[PDB]
Design a protein around this ligand. Structure first.
Ligand SMILES: CCCCCCCCCCCCC/C=C\[C@@H](O)[C@H](CO)NC(=O)CCCCCCC
Ligand SMILES: CCCCCCCCCCCCC/C=C\[C@@H](O)[C@H](CO)NC(=O)CCCCCCC
Ligand SMILES: *[C@@H]1O[C@H](CO)[C@@H](O[C@@H]2O[C@H](CO)[C@@H](O)[C@H](O)[C@H]2NC(C)=O)[C@H](O)[C@H]1NC(C)=O
Ligand SMILES: *[C@@H]1O[C@H](CO)[C@@H](O[C@@H]2O[C@H](CO)[C@@H](O)[C@H](O)[C@H]2NC(C)=O)[C@H](O)[C@H]1NC(C)=O
Ligand SMILES: *[C@@H]1O[C@H](CO)[C@@H](O[C@@H]2O[C@H](CO)[C@@H](O)[C@H](O)[C@H]2NC(C)=O)[C@H](O)[C@H]1NC(C)=O
Ligand SMILES: *[C@@H]1O[C@H](CO)[C@@H](O[C@@H]2O[C@H](CO)[C@@H](O)[C@H](O)[C@H]2NC(C)=O)[C@H](O)[C@H]1NC(C)=O
Ligand SMILES: CC(C)CCC[C@@H](C)[C@H]1CC[C@H]2[C@@H]3CC=C4C[C@@H](O)CC[C@]4(C)[C@H]3CC[C@]12C
Ligand SMILES: CC(C)CCC[C@@H](C)[C@H]1CC[C@H]2[C@@H]3CC=C4C[C@@H](O)CC[C@]4(C)[C@H]3CC[C@]12C
Ligand SMILES: CC(C)CCC[C@@H](C)[C@H]1CC[C@H]2[C@@H]3CC=C4C[C@@H](O)CC[C@]4(C)[C@H]3CC[C@]12C
Ligand SMILES: CC(C)CCC[C@@H](C)[C@H]1CC[C@H]2[C@@H]3CC=C4C[C@@H](O)CC[C@]4(C)[C@H]3CC[C@]12C
Ligand SMILES: CC(C)CCC[C@@H](C)[C@H]1CC[C@H]2[C@@H]3CC=C4C[C@@H](O)CC[C@]4(C)[C@H]3CC[C@]12C
Ligand SMILES: CC(C)CCC[C@@H](C)[C@H]1CC[C@H]2[C@@H]3CC=C4C[C@@H](O)CC[C@]4(C)[C@H]3CC[C@]12C
Ligand SMILES: CC(C)CCC[C@@H](C)[C@H]1CC[C@H]2[C@@H]3CC=C4C[C@@H](O)CC[C@]4(C)[C@H]3CC[C@]12C
Ligand SMILES: CC(C)CCC[C@@H](C)[C@H]1CC[C@H]2[C@@H]3CC=C4C[C@@H](O)CC[C@]4(C)[C@H]3CC[C@]12C
Ligand SMILES: CC(C)CCC[C@@H](C)[C@H]1CC[C@H]2[C@@H]3CC=C4C[C@@H](O)CC[C@]4(C)[C@H]3CC[C@]12C
Ligand SMILES: CC(C)CCC[C@@H](C)[C@H]1CC[C@H]2[C@@H]3CC=C4C[C@@H](O)CC[C@]4(C)[C@H]3CC[C@]12C
Ligand SMILES: CC(C)CCC[C@@H](C)[C@H]1CC[C@H]2[C@@H]3CC=C4C[C@@H](O)CC[C@]4(C)[C@H]3CC[C@]12C
Ligand SMILES: CC(C)CCC[C@@H](C)[C@H]1CC[C@H]2[C@@H]3CC=C4C[C@@H](O)CC[C@]4(C)[C@H]3CC[C@]12C
Ligand SMILES: CC(C)CCC[C@@H](C)[C@H]1CC[C@H]2[C@@H]3CC=C4C[C@@H](O)CC[C@]4(C)[C@H]3CC[C@]12C
Ligand SMILES: CCCCCCCC/C=C\CCCCCCCC(=O)O
Ligand SMILES: CCCCCCCC/C=C\CCCCCCCC(=O)O
Ligand SMILES: *[C@@H]1O[C@H](CO)[C@@H](O)[C@H](O)[C@H]1NC(C)=O
Ligand SMILES: *[C@@H]1O[C@H](CO)[C@@H](O)[C@H](O)[C@H]1NC(C)=O
Ligand SMILES: *[C@@H]1O[C@H](CO)[C@@H](O)[C@H](O)[C@H]1NC(C)=O
Ligand SMILES: *[C@@H]1O[C@H](CO)[C@@H](O)[C@H](O)[C@H]1NC(C)=O
Ligand SMILES: [Ca+2]
Ligand SMILES: [Ca+2]
Ligand SMILES: [Zn+2]
Ligand SMILES: [Zn+2]
Lengths: 647, 647
């Protein structure tokens, strides 16, 4: 079979459109010839059109280079998820470039394009082969382009000498189509197809936003390829089947803008760590100063088992979650799949094997303030015991331990947030609250009744409300039924609690009922994603309302308050308002697909290191500490009445 | 460029070897022609050989059919993991068949094969195109074949009219190379390459064994393709640098044998469920019978808060694990990746959305026997309270709840076992043991000391030993250090405990030390994969061994025993022996890669439903129940001594 390609290989030119017709007894060969100079990269792009009547007899296209062969067919055919098919009549591909070194010198390159078909009568085609002027990407310079499910794109980036780490930020002005962004190494071939893109590099599915962080040391040669591949359907990105438009002539054209920006330096790490440590060591320093001043001026002129049980429970609850999150982080590091953790990729600063270092360093406040509260409670206990030789000190010990464990579990959860972890930190608080309530009720004894046995009934209702939330997830009318059930339960539980402990009585009862109804309407506005956290927030705010009612009844001239109580309460109110502002900024969400969560990402504001969530962590820790301080030292004037005052 | 393929397309013959030389000015074209008859499937296979000097100028091969174009190059190039390359001189592929049905009638088919190269002098090649006689697979008939990294294979299976579910079992005699087995649907194209095989169907990585279960209703047309693809390196399958035989020219040939077998029916499900329920309801029936007999013959002629605390802890520990395993199962069902859960794939029988129904139904014994034990203890407590108007009843309630929770947590773990789940069920037991020991020590009071505070020191040593095991995993001499440490700790802890409670005393001390040293030797022989479970087993065996000294001392004519105690001890001894036998048959392991774990899979022996692990579950539950019964009813004869006997 002696065939000479050069006999019919037409010497073709770049940037020229060739029309043709091919059938069984015909085949078309085009020969393209060019030269590559040193220290310069040239990419070639091939475009083929064919009309859609060629369904049973497509047009087969083959591209031959010195070491590679590529091939496809027009129109491209895609298989849907629900037995549906799509066809695209325009196909474009970029051929893998070969860099030229000064030692090698300029090289001559030859390319062959073969177009064939098996149509009995004839198939029409149009061909166009061009060079790419915009192939190499520059730092800090935004680049716009367009992609299609049959026309994938990819570009080249070279690391600058000084830069040690970069971030690729990709933004589109509209979702649907949804795509995949991949980063791969230089060596050919380049996997830019739907069925092999998620094989080599690191990739992220995206609809409106995407961000990837890279380090120089992981790329030999200090260069990489960025590949953009569109998908035929939006099922994987939270959408439905094909959204046909007026122009859809099948095409899903997505307009994209890409930027590559250098990352921060380690001085930012040092400054952020020092600030975070000092802002909370200031509390210890101030407490020591106040104690020293009081000693200089004013002085001159049983529960152990209830502590060790909680310690044991905390340790043996914390260990497995630590192991699980370690496994998650290792898997994410190894595989390169970045759709596992729901980070805030715009301000996820890594350190070592850690992906988001800031989100873990932000939890220092919980631990430090819990330890300081434990120290204060221990001081009070020691002083009381020495004076005797103040009854619920075990409750305050449990409070401090719960604060510290909240910090620890939040740090564990933020290693890799997904939809299989929030439950641990949500449920530890339920366990601690149940233990504390049971111990308090037993310590109070029945005596009269006591009260009306509402506490364990409410806790049980909480238990199967959590069970029901586990069973049915956003299931028809069950959602509204359980929502109304829990709201009414909280309402009448607060009602009976305030009644069992006189116009102020029913005035405050009506106020509390109105506040609970306001909570109900707020929940009606925005549906609650998770039931356990919703109930926990309602429970905490109900306790705050009860504390407010208690202090308002104490402030009716029956008793007095020291400077420390009202200083603590005003600090608590201010800090709670400040924290509640930041609580409503959600930069990610495990409720939806990773792309939808990525749509909400935001840059960070404080010293270029901390986003809204870190500030929320800080403020919540401070507010909880001050609220606990209010709770502990509220009854101090009653010490004036001697002979075994209120405990 | 008008070119006629038929001018040089030599009419070629099947099963004939064609040799040739091609270069820049020469291209070889072969035309193959055949016919497909109705109700018959034919597949075509293409083979290309090329020598090794064609490194910079390979041979490019293109295959053209009516609706598909395929292409590759010889020698095939593969990229390693640490910057290495491999080249293969022989390539072969199977073309996607098109089945002809009676309404369409026989179809004439034409195929073109084009061979080209850009060598400046000349490149040699050899080509052979054949039909496949053995393409369709039959039921219960083994089939042998051979595969290579550059010669993937795949076959077709059609569901019989009556079989509703099948199992594909693949077996090879030697690992290294390690391969991938995939199941996909009928519609072309077929992904049989390293970079796209894990995209559409369901797949498993294998070295010696593989097993996949399929249901008919998931496949339109009731047929599928089974694809076998070998890998260039063994890194993903627990392997090191690829092994090269003395003979090998590079080629990693793998001999495989594949069988397809129908699955079991629902009658087995019904029979197994009935047997599992009744074998444990027999205990309730016998207890009721003995109570009725005792009533007919012999009669004719404070802790509440502890129970509720334990219940709260159990519930709020159990829930998040349930959510986590639900998420795991949903993910493994959706993504089709069967390397996530470490099942025993040879006897994993699905039901609904459950992948291994037997491994969960085998846990009924724990729950049922725990309920029976709790009922017995409650009866004893009620009778004692009625007689008064019997001290550690809270401890026995704790044991019953612990049996409940062991059953529940093991059932949760077996939903999808991997290297993230054993920690929960391991740690709950440590938490329960610590709480119970603390309660016992506090209630018994120091009085004298009490003892030497050995228990708290031992538990602390357990604490940071578990922490260290979390930190260092098989890290050089540290492994041996911690091993010797906890064996020594157990030895002297047991020595102190027995000494604090007389040649018999020294005899028993020597016996206990020798037993602990035997444990140390056994641990030296086989390394402990997990530290926490090793410590738990050591503690359990030491506990029943301490019970052994207790009874042997009690039978020194000072006191007697009733029929129930010695029946219980003989029962627990024999059932512990049987359970310990079944405990050493490991059919899966998360220590290694999924393929290495699959190497240990085994069929199931009991009623075609239950493997060895299920028998272990049953026997362990029964043995634990009888040991608890031994503990509860050991001191009954001393009730003869009235006036406030021992509590
Ligand atoms: C019975 C005696 C006291 C028991 C003490 C233990 C239980 C009280 C909570 C202890 C501190 C845990 C912190 C609570 C909540 C927040 O961290 C989280 C947000 O991550 N949940 C949320 O839901 C957000 C917070 C909701 C805010 C409500 C409005 C102020
Ligand atoms: C201290 C007062 C009583 C406390 C009661 C609660 C704590 C004791 C443990 C209760 C039983 C839990 C189950 C134990 C073991 C097995 O399930 C597992 C293997 O699945 N571990 C294993 O290690 C296997 C079993 C090892 C057996 C060794 C030889 C008998
Ligand atoms: C479609 O195929 C037919 C034959 O199957 C082609 O007809 C002849 O093609 C040769 C090839 O160069 C010409 O030399 C003859 O002149 C053609 N015959 C006639 C009567 O025109 C036909 O050319 C093919 N279609 C196209 C567009 O090339
Ligand atoms: C293939 O079809 C596309 C779409 O019909 C053609 O793209 C058009 O190109 C012209 C430039 O000559 C533009 O003015 C039009 O706006 C384009 N149409 C669009 C963007 O929808 C393309 O020229 C055709 N030919 C090739 C070789 O691609
Ligand atoms: C290798 O290429 C050279 C030129 O590029 C071929 O030399 C001529 O090839 C044509 C077509 O095959 C023949 O008609 C001439 O007779 C060849 N010239 C000579 C001097 O032999 C050469 O044939 C190619 N190699 C092979 C094996 O065909
Ligand atoms: C390609 O090379 C292989 C290996 O050299 C050839 O396979 C040999 O085939 C013959 C029969 O023709 C056997 O007797 C040998 O044992 C085979 N060698 C092996 C398996 O290593 C093959 O024939 C060559 N040609 C083609 C077209 O594949
Ligand atoms: C190799 C490059 C990244 C070095 C840059 C130095 C950075 C990574 C170092 C310098 C100061 C360090 C911090 C100093 C103090 C603390 C508080 C301590 O309780 C936890 C560790 C932590 C938070 C350190 C983390 C690592 C740190 C931020
Ligand atoms: C025995 C009882 C009454 C002791 C009560 C605890 C005392 C020592 C605690 C409770 C509230 C504390 C204050 C709370 C907040 C601040 C603001 C901070 O920027 C400096 C420290 C300072 C000023 C703390 C000093 C110590 C403090 C006064
Ligand atoms: C009570 C106080 C002392 C508790 C302090 C807990 C701190 C030190 C623990 C809790 C959770 C831990 C993290 C859990 C998981 C991982 C992932 C692993 O790949 C690197 C270490 C890292 C990031 C751990 C670092 C240490 C860590 C932050
Ligand atoms: C040594 C290897 C084989 C251990 C296997 C563990 C890996 C493969 C498992 C363990 C935990 C798993 C993840 C658990 C939860 C999620 C979140 C979900 O939205 C997508 C699936 C995903 C991301 C799972 C993917 C597979 C996974 C990462
Ligand atoms: C005592 C406590 C721990 C018992 C908790 C039982 C809960 C977790 C169990 C009992 C019944 C279970 C359900 C039974 C059936 C189905 C239908 C299936 O398509 C999805 C899972 C789902 C919805 C199960 C989810 C888990 C479930 C709700
Ligand atoms: C959405 C789920 C998953 C988590 C968040 C749920 C909890 C923490 C949320 C949901 C409803 C919220 C409350 C709704 C309304 C009010 C009244 C307003 O004057 C102060 C804030 C307050 C009191 C909110 C506090 C936080 C809250 C209790
Ligand atoms: C302890 C509590 C009751 C103290 C007072 C809390 C007040 C000051 C808090 C609670 C609810 C908060 C608001 C909740 C929601 C929003 C909408 C947002 O787009 C801007 C901030 C804004 C408007 C917050 C401002 C501060 C706010 C009004
Ligand atoms: C549609 C096909 C699969 C129907 C076949 C019937 C099978 C699946 C049915 C028939 C009898 C059933 C069992 C009957 C009793 C029990 C004990 C109970 O404590 C849990 C459910 C369990 C274990 C059932 C599981 C499902 C079961 C085995
Ligand atoms: C108050 C004290 C003495 C109560 C003692 C519990 C008695 C009633 C229990 C403890 C051990 C029990 C036995 C344990 C196991 C079996 C084997 C079974 O195939 C028949 C019932 C039988 C033989 C049980 C009968 C009831 C039994 C004897
Ligand atoms: C104290 C007794 C009553 C507790 C009984 C617990 C049993 C009924 C619970 C505990 C764990 C549960 C399983 C946990 C996870 C899943 C996966 C989900 O996709 C289907 C339900 C299934 C398979 C649950 C079935 C019911 C289950 C086995
Ligand atoms: C109070 C208890 C819960 C604290 C337990 C601390 C444990 C979980 C922490 C403390 C120090 C941590 C280690 C610190 C550094 C490294 C090196 C890194 O390459 C792998 C993770 C590893 C090995 C961490 C694993 C988690 C770790 C061991
Ligand atoms: C291997 C890890 C992961 C889990 C298993 C650890 C525990 C359960 C194993 C390891 C060592 C084992 C012991 C080794 C030696 C003896 C003495 C022999 O006469 C009876 C079995 C007995 C008493 C074994 C019981 C089970 C045991 C304690
Ligand atoms: C409570 C205990 C001390 C009762 C006596 C336990 C005896 C009978 C048990 C403990 C360890 C067991 C052995 C463990 C492992 C093996 C190796 C296996 O290939 C054959 C069975 C054999 C040899 C078992 C036989 C039974 C065995 C010897
Ligand atoms: C409750 C959380 C409190 C957080 C305290 C500070 C957290 C410090 C965490 C670990 C820092 C070092 C480990 C990070 C990766 C180790 C790799 C390396 O450092 O080289
Ligand atoms: C401690 C565990 C004891 C196990 C008791 C029996 C387990 C029964 C588990 C659930 C059975 C029904 C759920 C299985 C899949 C439901 C889907 C379906 O049946 O259609
Ligand atoms: C490609 O162009 C160069 C420049 O003139 C020429 O020397 C070379 O022969 C051309 N290649 C072919 C195959 O014609
Ligand atoms: C290659 O050599 C030329 C000759 O001066 C030089 O300009 C160029 O920088 C060299 N390439 C590199 C990468 O240094
Ligand atoms: C293939 O063989 C059949 C049988 O003789 C013949 O009719 C047909 O023309 C052949 N195909 C071609 C392209 O000649
Ligand atoms: C098609 O028709 C033939 C004619 O007898 C028959 O044998 C064959 O079974 C039919 N095909 C099917 C799928 O039934
Ligand atoms: Ca590449
Ligand atoms: Ca397919
Ligand atoms: Zn958080
Ligand atoms: Zn098990």
């Amino acid at each position: 079979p002696r065939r000479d390609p050069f006999d019919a290989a037409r010497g073709a030119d770049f940037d020229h459109v060739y029309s043709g017709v091919v059938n069984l007894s015909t085949e078309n060969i085009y020969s393209f010839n060019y030269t590559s100079q040193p220290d310069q990269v040239t990419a070639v792009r091939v475009y083929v059109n064919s009309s859609s009547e060629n369904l049973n007899y497509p047009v087969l296209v083959v591209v031959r280079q010195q070491k590679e062969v590529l091939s496809w067919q027009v129109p491209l055919l895609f298989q849907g998820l629900y037995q549906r098919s799509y066809n695209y009549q325009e196909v474009s591909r970029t051929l893998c470039p070969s860099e030229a070194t000064n030692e090698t010198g300029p090289l001559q390159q030859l390319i062959f394009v073969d177009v064939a078909s098996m149509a009995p009568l004839g198939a029409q085609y149009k061909l166009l082969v061009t060079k790419l002027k915009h192939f190499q990407l520059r730092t800090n310079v935004a680049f716009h382009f367009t992609a299609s499910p049959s026309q994938p794109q990819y570009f080249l980036y070279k690391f600058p000498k000084d830069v040690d780490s970069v971030i690729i930020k990709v933004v589109s002005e509209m979702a649907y189509p949804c795509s995949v962004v991949s980063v791969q190494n230089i060596m050919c071939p380049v996997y830019d197809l739907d069925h092999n893109v998620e094989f080599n590099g690191v990739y992220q599915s995206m609809t409106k936003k995407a961000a990837i962080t890279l380090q120089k040391k992981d790329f030999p040669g200090e260069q990489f390829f960025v590949v953009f591949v569109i998908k035929p359907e939006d099922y994987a990105c939270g959408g439905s089947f094909f959204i046909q438009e007026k122009e859809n002539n099948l095409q899903r054209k997505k307009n994209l803008e890409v930027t590559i920006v250098p990352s921060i330096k380690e001085s930012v790490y040092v400054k952020s760590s020092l600030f975070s440590v000092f802002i909370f060591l200031s509390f210890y320093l101030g407490c020591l100063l106040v104690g020293f001043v009081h000693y200089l001026r004013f002085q001159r002129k049983k529960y152990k088992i209830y502590f060790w049980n909680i310690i044991t429970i905390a340790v043996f609850y914390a260990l497995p979650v630590i192991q699980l999150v370690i496994t998650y982080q290792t898997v994410v590091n190894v595989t390169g799949n970045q759709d596992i953790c729901y980070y805030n990729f715009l301000c996820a600063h890594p350190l070592g094997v850690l992906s988001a270092f800031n989100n873990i360093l932000s939890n220092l406040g919980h631990v430090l303030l819990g330890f300081l509260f434990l120290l204060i409670v221990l001081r009070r206990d020691i002083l009381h015991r020495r004076a005797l030789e103040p009854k619920h000190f075990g409750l305050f010990y449990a409070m401090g331990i719960a604060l510290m464990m909240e910090g620890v579990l939040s740090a564990c959860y933020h290693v890799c947030p997904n939809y299989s972890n929030f439950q641990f930190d949500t449920s530890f608080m339920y366990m601690i609250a149940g233990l504390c309530m049971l111990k308090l009720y037993q310590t109070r004894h029945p005596d009269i009744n006591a009260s009306a046995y509402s506490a364990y009934a409410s806790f049980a209702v909480v238990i199967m409300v959590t069970v029901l939330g586990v069973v049915f997830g956003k299931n028809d009318v069950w959602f509204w039924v359980i929502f109304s059930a829990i709201h009414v339960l909280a309402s009448l539980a607060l009602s009976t609690q305030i009644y069992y402990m006189y116009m102020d009585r029913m005035v405050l009862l009506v106020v509390g009922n109105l506040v609970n109804w306001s909570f109900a309407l707020f929940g009606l506005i925005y549906r609650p994603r998770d039931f356990a956290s919703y109930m926990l927030g309602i429970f905490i705010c109900n306790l705050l309302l009860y504390l407010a009612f208690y202090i308002i009844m104490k402030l009716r001239s029956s008793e007095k308050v020291l400077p420390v109580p009202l200083f603590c309460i005003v600090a608590t109110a201010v800090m709670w308002a400040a924290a509640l502002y930041f609580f409503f900024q959600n930069l990610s969400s495990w409720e939806g697909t990773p792309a939808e969560s990525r749509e909400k990402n935001r840059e960070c504001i404080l010293l270029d290191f901390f986003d809204d969530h870190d500030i929320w962590h800080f403020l919540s820790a401070t507010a909880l500490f001050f609220s606990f301080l209010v709770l502990l030292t509220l009854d101090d004037d009653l010490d004036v009445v001697r002979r075994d005052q209120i405990p």
